[model samples]
Target: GIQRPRDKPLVFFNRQPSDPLTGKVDMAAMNWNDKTYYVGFDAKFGGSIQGKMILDFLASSESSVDRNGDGIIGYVLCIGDVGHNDSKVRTEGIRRALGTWTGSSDPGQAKEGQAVVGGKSYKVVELEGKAMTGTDGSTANTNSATESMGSWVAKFADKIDLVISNNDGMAMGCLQASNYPRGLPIFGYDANADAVESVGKGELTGTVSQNVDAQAVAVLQIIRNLLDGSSGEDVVANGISRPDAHGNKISAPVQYWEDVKAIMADNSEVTSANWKEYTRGARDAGVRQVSAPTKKVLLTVHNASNDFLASAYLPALKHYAPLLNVDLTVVQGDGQNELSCLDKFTNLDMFDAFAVNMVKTNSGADYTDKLKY
Candidate 1:
């Protein structure tokens, strides 16, 4: 599903579902025509996995949470980089949004509200106070999130449960904050492929599976279908699996993976070993040499264009861009010390991919807050 021009899931802003009597989690009577969805603008759009899923959830009319027919669930988008210091959080946020394509439909990721990662154990570091200020007033550039994340976790150290972090790295950091506790579990949104591997190895539980750039192609295809006026359907490449209310098999509209979807594979217990064995076939078959399209991903640091290039970001792409024809352009955001270096690679208009920092790990992010990807 290319991002529906207007329809989106998050578009339905904070539509508090209320029971006619009890007023809690009641989604039955929510009127589609009566409400305008609040598909929160995710800075990365459908290019990111998280953005794609968020986009699709809004597009699918059958979705219960799609409260409004506008086809989206959020509105005031929260950007990845803005959430922290790293653009990875931004990039990954965009990556996870793309839940489109054949195989992607059944990622069947972990059940909602499930503990995905495990805790290694943690200890209280310390807490301090600061002068609170509103947006209208002046604010100090401090690593507020760093301290907040620790303090928040400290209070719930014994009850380490799940999280909705700004990015996967911070989610990992939270685990670290736990001092690698062996019992408590941690879960988060924007499922990190690396995190999935770590968790599959029994290193952690799970997260909201999302791979943005990995999803761009699928979104593109869906967009094409939509423009073609074809009815929206789930993408499936393997075979008919999910059935409708009448028990009819549904055709898939996108491609899925052994990682993200595996974690989200609902109503099923998917082991990482199974996914590895399955994916190993593709790599083990000597199919890693294919050439693919390269998107010139870009990133804008503090909304400025990058001038001098950063070598720290070029090595990996320089070596691998050819395999995929992708060119990485990493640079420091220009003037005002806000060069959009990350934009060099993530700008869909310029590059196909981009690298960014872990928002949660950034020196001064509000880690205590819930990150709505």
Candidate 2:
């Protein structure tokens, strides 16, 4: 009874297993309200959707690979772990995008990779490219990765018109592999520091960035909220859900959508702008604890012989003292020199702040001043 099969199981992040959940919150699988919102900076869509524009740009080009130049604009995609989430997603995006275009006579092309998007069959026009794919074991860190994808390109080096890489590393590899003086439309992800430099040099078309730090800070904020007892209302809201009980089918929980930013190459303003933060390790991305104190301040205001503004000074210090934890030591003096003003207040060095108004100085070369030794 305690562990009912019908009951929902909840898992929390950075929380102790002993920590009790507010059972008042219901958990549902596949809740319509559960949404995954991501910030794509200028890129509103993910790998698949964004790749469409890149393909179109190439398809429309007036080069030898243009709509009228050849039967099909040959291109290649250097993939990472084909099974990996990011790689798979981007490849799928390219698939659907290519499907919409009209070209590639080989109907079998669809089975291999081509997806002509018309009524069941492609509208066989003359606008599109025959795309190819390859993988370098999913890791693009070393020069060998470059060699692997580059070798794949060498097979159809002449017909190849462009390259889309799951990462800039692979893109870089493709560059080394291509014998063309001016490389094809090479698009990359991870707007890396080096990749940005490449973009500046006109080597790459563009790229995207993972503002992981922003996401990390957001997680910290959510964790802080949960620890503080304000409840997680702002962090999570009730979403669409199915009924708890069903005749034959079992209901699932709603989904949780956390949006994160996607930085684009063109919008980076200056290529090197975020080079530091982007390269900074995750260890450096935690929430900063700026330990500051209450006011702990001692302030003073201008004064004189007859018209002393001690009243004004008193109100400000008193009003803000309790609220801001300000330590106040107020002093008033005459319209004299810096020495006299300093002498007027006891232990002047002990005060946190001191103020003075325009007055005639009795000291040499000290005409009008706001502070003194």
Candidate 3:
């Protein structure tokens, strides 16, 4: 639907550019423009890591992770959006870890299943996995999660042993639903500030931190490198080496899909033992002050209200922009339609570069065409 900009560099964050027809990430297309690049967490890897954390928690006897103790581990999944890369992989990760994976792209929506872990046989029931999006089609909202959990509690309350969500918003929503049990072991991704707090309070079993601080820094640093005339390889390598606001090193490297353009930021698990280290304030603990000339940059997010983006990524971006010598302007979309953001583009010649988080993964062309520079 759109083509690469004739001039100006564009970098994608949180999500990567994909083929509109196949709805799959197009690795080769990343090089359609010399300045095109991607900076984001590895959803597949992070989701599997989340699954491992749940498995480890369940395997341990110290906690009653298996709440009902009926030799059946019933878990209700809160999916962010159907066909969403993050949601699909996270669900696959949980199911894969729990031994319920059907080896298909089935999204784990079945009502019942079985698995065995730690040499013990247990019935693994998947009560539900509807895409938890709002009316605008923006995914991972707490309202829908709350409503879904309420209904699940009414139908299969006692059968639900653990709660797994694609992101923290839905995990927090499951906790907020009325009549939901207090101590049930719930696991989520995107370790948002509130979700980490919930982990500390022993409400949420654990959550995955997608390293929002590091990702924010990486995206801006990539733009800065490109503006400074860095080569594509150097731009990717430097972005990978860029530290978080706290000056802590980021572990993800410039990974190539079929030797194509893509860089992934690593993720970590936040549990009760280490949740305090991930408090909201820690995201901006240290600012990396630089001496380079300020570069004007425009950043567009798919949804500003999404928990991780709003609480962690946006704050880190705002906190680091000035320190990194970037004059930043941010725009947000209605979460459902790409046009909500694509239509907001104005005065493209004013900014030195652009970083986008598209509402839909396949709509990268819509963004590139708008950058007439």
Candidate 4:
């Protein structure tokens, strides 16, 4: 059901003129011009993508709101949680994230350090919860945070600029429910990977943060190295390289490269930001690595030619599978043959899920040719 990408997919979100990942005050920050970011929450508790992520984070762990306090289970507090859909930071995950963010509180001027998103003052909540909280069922005391956010923001559409919501559901809801124009900037987190192409085209601003798969692979290596007495050596990739106390290359292994060497030599002076200025000869690289091409569904043009088949379903599956972890291999049956020339549906899989096709006649066909793909 899950994969620790041992080899994570490397992706980049193109941000020009202003890049928050830059660690410097980019244009957006430099001018201090108030941004009207759109943030949506669950008018009834599931409006924002952030709200869902929050709920998802909490539900998975004991650190979420623990209601019973018998020291058993944790409450996710997510009313909309469904199977295999834990994108939000339910309860426990919030605890951990809160710890990292270190919540702050202040009713300062909306213009002050406080982010006056949508006109309401939001005090950053300090880290208070633990990795594990009280016993048993979900916490009953906590309020349904989704609703207040969704409804309140709706009232102050003019004041709000940047919406740091949890997921697309709430964001979409805000889009439809709000009475504002659609040109405002919307930032979203999570590498959903589905809308990457669209967002890159200015449809949305997405966060492709976190190298989780790489981290997982690195951890796996650390564990294996630990068990095999390969404790330390020159681990040039993830962490520092060193040998075990017994003077064996048991732990660390370093994959030092020319670029890595540059960083190691003077990290304070050298960084990716400076690379553009270093005249690195473009590195002859692309913003995104060319992924190995994969197989696709077997598509047979019944009435039309291969070109016709490709034109129709090419983008359909493009929007579908992979997002669902389903690999659809396109099978080209005949070059320009009609549906009648081929026997019956050869690619049984097309019909396995949601089978769709275009008949040759295009005469408002009435399912006469019953052989389904």
Candidate 5:
């Protein structure tokens, strides 16, 4: 476990640390201590937005999402990880929007069910496959998703109308398993490059862009502000003010302390109609060159192989870090556990600031405890 350094400012990105017992965002337990902050999108809000998009797509006249024409939407959900907060909420978000939520925290496993869409009753046949642990013991990988998709296709056959994945990696896996069947509306999150291209080709229905670039830039901006002697409020406010290379601003946090301690980036839905725009990449327009003195910063990402993080988020950080006059060092984790990257923390006093994406949401203290002034 890492100790919190009093002098170095720390900011967590992508995933926030939560209480291990209550499973809620707990900055206090993480020793955030006002010096530490967070920059990421709200999983709940983003999941709901994704649900609404799926609902709209299903209700649209042009959508042939229901291929069987039985007034039923038979969909299979590819869960990224059962323990992952994002996966849980994304699953619940779809169920909540589709009127399939059972009001239970567990969100339950997928099975034959009923859901309502646009005030109309419909038969909702649901099947879900949780991605198995990969070679590195990571639950979030494409190979497991491919295996799950293959099994679902073999058993369910034509009954599977729509495919919903917690992330794009699994969605791509499903597409690959099914041999990229034409006209099947498969919705996913994380709007990865290949997934976006698939959307343009009409293989995947749509995806949610988690605003990877915006979030990355905002994380750096917050660290920049703190290094410049800005207070917590100013740090957050200024972070929100900094825009991504695409000229998009991150949304302000509801509060700057306690459980509400995170500023979120805007998430957009990508589909065939607008997929072309997203393909231009996160840092296509170039970042704003800042006049601040060069500050040394460290960014640690949880998973090195994640398609969204590796392909989009990391690249965005690399592109914008220098533009913001930050001397950035990025570290990658093995994805097996939260401690992998945290254990790699050496010479903590060398850097002016720190930004981390923990592999597990409950391991913030492991990083905070190691940071000593």
Candidate 6:
């Protein structure tokens, strides 16, 4: 039986507040549980790391691609949703490294000069999830990115230099938007399958990986503790500890931080020679290939609820599906209800099982009883 969220009570995770410009974590100032329980990597590091990589690439003297040949890098910020958490972290990360950046969240209709970075200029492009994704929050597809970025590329062809995005979706979108035959160095975060493939094809410059499996394991540890009736202190005792004035071991709010690494095509040697391993590694965590399966699974995701697909599992599913022999289909749901996407089905009997996100009937008895199964 599926567990009720209320039964879980409180859950804690790691998150960090970083320096606005440096993306540096101030450990002394951070805390956890209640709210701190939900913390993780100061998110800025991903942004910080991303910004530095793009700047470093432009600073290189051996580069063949140069928009102005004036040492000033021209680029576009392909953000998923400016108002969202991930986008803000990355935007600040990019801005801090650039020294100055200003633009609208809606990149499609944004003004040119309005988008500037560290005295250098760039364009701001926002991909609409509803229109492009046909869902909410996550990148619907590279089409919207292509459609939105194509306009900018046409207008800024002379001044445009490179592409940078919060994730591979928009980065790939920029690549497709500019036409597959690339002209600029593209950098993305998440090191997703498509981005890795693009990097292998020499289409993308590089990307950063959040070490997804490690992060998942860390969260699992917390869940296990809760299941075992372990308090926050029990989890912290086996982990790091801080001291008080009396030399006593003070119980700090438990925090688990996973590592983030950059997967650059050149430095990481991510050529076709080793691309398969990276793809395989990405597929290992949640979905994988095997000799047999007990049952097939059907999943539905709606941005109107949460975005575990684009933000988390979609790329993995794509790579694993070919090898796993698992019968799965992802349907995007409208925000109206849980069955909104599955509404086409007159009979639920065909599906062996169903998984849903952002169901609105949470408080009702119908929701409570139906979810019990």
Q: Which model scores highest in TM-score?
A: 5
lDDT of 5 by residue, 255-335 (tens): 234356677766778888878767746463435677777888878988899876897788888887887889999889988
lDDT of each candidate versus the true structure? 0.29, 0.38, 0.74, 0.27, 0.72, 0.46
The better-scoring model by lDDT among 3 and 5 is 3
From the highest lDDT down, the ranking of the candidates is: 3, 5, 6, 2, 1, 4
lDDT string for model 3 (28-57, tens) is: 447557788777766569778988898877
Candidate 3, number of clashes: 0
Question: Which residue runs does candidate 1 get wrong by more than 4 Å?
Answer: 1-160, 178-181, 188-197, 207-373
Per-residue lDDT for 1-373 in model 4, tens only? 1022111111101111133244231332112211101111111121233333433323332422222232222111111222212322432233233332223211111111222223333322311121111144322111222343344345443344333333333333333433423544333333334323335444443322222222222322232222233322422222223332322221212222231111011111111222222121111111112122222222223333554235423443333333222344443334343344334434343332112232322211122123211
Q: Candidate 5, 324: how far from true, in Å?
A: 0.8
Give each model a TM-score.
0.30, 0.41, 0.69, 0.27, 0.70, 0.48
- Model 1, range 219-329, lDDT digits (tens) per residue? 222222222333324322211234322222212122333221111111111123332421111111111232333344332222223211122123322433333333445
Per residue, candidate 2 scores C-alpha lDDT tens digits across 1-373 of: 1122112111121111111233121122112121211111233246643466555454444554432344444556655554456765555555456653223222123322332222122222212222223344334443544554456455654555566666676776656654533746677776555776776676776665544333222222222222233233433321112111111110111223332111121222112233443432322222223222332223323344532134222442354334323355555445454455445444544433322222322121221122233
lDDT of 6 by residue, 87-169 (tens): 76676666556554454333343222223344444443322212234234455356677775787666666455666677788
Alpha-carbon shift of residue 191 in model 4 (angstroms): 1.8
Q: Candidate 1 clash total?
A: 140
How displaced is residue 291 in candidate 3, in Å? 2.2
Candidates 3 and 5 compared: the better one by TM-score is: 5
lDDT, residue 242, model 3:
58
lDDT of 5 at 239: 45
Worst 10 residues of 1 by lDDT: 363-372
Query: Candidate 3: misplaced stretches above 4 Å?
Result: 1-8, 24-29, 60-88, 103-161, 165-182, 242-248, 251-258, 284-287, 301-312, 331-349, 357-373
Sliding window of 10 residues with minimal summed lDDT for model 4? 262-271
**Better-scoring candidate (TM-score), 1 or 2:** 2
Candidate 5 achieves a global lDDT of 0.72
